[PDB]
Design a protein around this nucleic acid. Structure first.
Lengths: 183, 183, 185, 185
DNA sequence: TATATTATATAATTTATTAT
DNA sequence: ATAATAAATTATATAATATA
DNA sequence: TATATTATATAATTTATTAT
DNA sequence: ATAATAAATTATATAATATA
DNA sequence: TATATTATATAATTTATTAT
DNA sequence: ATAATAAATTATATAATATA
DNA sequence: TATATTATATAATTTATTAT
DNA sequence: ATAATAAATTATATAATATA
């Protein structure tokens, strides 16, 4: 019974080590899923940039993309212009899917420049002169040029809803890009 | 909440690994205890051998045992004989603590030699002649020279009780040997 | 004999070879941390120089937490605030003297078209759009004229190399300045 | 450059050195199993030769389980049993011919006293006890006469060495005999 | 550094050996 | 089997290396 | 997928037992 | 040493688990 | 061999750059 | 800010090595 | 007991925002 | 580019856990 108890403890240890191995594999699988999710959310909110024409052409050739752009460099002017116009129509359709990111309000000296910039001024000269005016302000004079807590929370709410909808917009864009014929 | 769940799984994994480390240390400690127990039970049932005189002398000198036996080799005859007589009295007292192991009954050809050996015979000649007689027996003639199942189970019961009491006897002997003054 | 003799020799070689492996693992770990420190320093020595905020200036001279330090700087009077701002500005002049601004690469393609063909315009967005229309109406060899030659590219390569070098020494001198700078203002 | 160059060289040395360590671990494992097989064979080549049981003899010639084989051998008739016993005995004579019995070391101390001073006795236990009384009544130099000289010890050392050698060849020949032995009886 | 190896230093026990 | 001894073998203890 | 464990299934060896 | 065995112990092989 | 590294091969995206 | 491009940087995919 | 992690606390840098 | 900031992001340091 001494060795019986000891073997019983050995068997519980081997079972416990098996449960640990399963939990490690479960956290690894879930971690890979969350890493893919984070990558997707990063691309779905990124800055939308007009696709270059070579990348368009490699999108439409099932050969490898690099060689396709290389062959696109040697193209004549006429086929190159046809590809560029088709790429531009695709660009209009593509940018349609996305909503531009909510901008935050001008604050402090930025708001001062927003209010006291007058049309037809040297930007460097106006910025420096406005800076000299701004620096001479007392701290409560500056404190009235800040964004209220109400507008800050409104921008928080708008950025939050946009962080949501850019996910769905990006998915719709990806479906558009996979199923887009030149036509 | 994705990362919340994932971290929760990571924390359960670190707790589970801690429980596993504790269980491994528990089985290691218990394993060492059982190994000491088995060693003790092995010595408590071993064959009792009369202690050599040098080992006696090293028992009684708190210097290291090997050097003590080495100094005991160079001893004169008189002190050597005093140590040997004291060791012999210790041997009588020591062998008193132990019960000799139950012998199993003679079986088969051994029992045949037990029954047909007659006093004053060449042992090699009697053993060989009895072997020639034995081999010529039929299988049921041999089968009556075996130990009955009843006596086999009786020897099992006796060896079992002895395996028990040799533990207690050995412990009493160890207490005797630690607390024994020559006197 | 020789079976056990060979076996013992290999067992000794493994224990020595295992110590050698353990040493290389910590040495490559050491060099990896060192080369990373080397990277983050050469990165800081080349970044864009930004005028230190006054709260950060005030926290530089107090051996306390930076958050607590800037919080104490916000509640300053207007005069004390102006004195710290003037001291921070004298510091910033002395600091920006140490650095060389990064060499820019030449304008290429449409950027060079704007650089060569920009005429003063009251509306910049219409001006850039008009230059875009002129550029797009150009042929491919007309556009190809507006690219940077290999000579200008290699000159910028050597300029960026010498600058990446010298910014390390500039940053080292700046750090010596920042450690040994008494407020004095 | 050279920071990363040195670091990459050490990282490559560790991965090669790690393969070298993995190889030595399995090689020392291989040699350890091999040297253990070497030990168990030289051990079997020198053990005391015991006449093979008839059930084990019968199981040698059947490609079945040994327990089942001896069970089939127990239920044999007396005549068939005698035939197998005679065949096993012819086998045992042919087998024990292959081996040399182990050289014994000379009797020493009280054993040599018994070897030199044993006179025929009807009661052996009283005889050994009487020799014990004669021995114990001897002085220490009288006892010291009855020990084995260094010359006889070294002769036994060389004899045991040559025997430990030759028993390997004897056991090898016996195994060739046992593999190539047809029952024939 | 606790806590397995390992190893190496020392003591305890068994074995061999005589005869039978 | 009785019986006695060194030698060999095994076991045990303590120190060193190595691995959690 | 080799390759330590490990475990356990089967066989091989050794032991004990008579007498002494 | 003589000799024949059941039984106990050890060794080897085969199958399963597991950890490189 | 599943299943982390890693690495190396290829594609996607951002940056710099002109003027302001 | 507008706008256009190669180049650089980053990210992604696939293949190889290594570690459970 | 160094020494990877790791985690999290604090500080440093960069970004965005106005105009353009 | 000019310039001043809150805020966001990244980097560095300090403290805790953990695995050599």
């Amino acid at each position: 019974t001494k060795a019986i108890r000891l073997q019983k403890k050995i068997n519980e240890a081997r079972s416990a080590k098996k449960n640990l191995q399963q939990q490690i594999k479960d956290i690894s699988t879930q971690h890979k899923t969350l890493s893919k999710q984070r990558k997707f959310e990063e691309k779905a909110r990124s800055k939308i940039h007009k696709l270059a024409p070579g990348n368009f052409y490699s999108m439409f050739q099932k050969k490898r993309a690099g060689d396709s752009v290389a062959e696109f460099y040697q193209f004549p002017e006429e086929e190159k212009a046809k590809w560029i116009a088709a790429r531009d129509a695709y660009w209009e359709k593509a940018k349609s899917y996305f909503t531009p990111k909510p901008k935050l309000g001008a604050n402090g000296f930025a708001k001062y420049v927003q209010e006291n910039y007058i049309r037809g001024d040297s930007l460097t000269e106006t910025m420096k002169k406005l800076a000299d005016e701004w620096n001479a302000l007392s701290e409560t004079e500056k404190q009235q040029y800040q964004i209220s807590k109400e507008d800050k929370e409104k921008y928080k709410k708008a950025l939050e809803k946009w962080k949501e909808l850019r996910l769905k917009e990006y998915s719709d864009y990806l479906k558009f890009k996979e199923n887009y014929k030149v036509e």
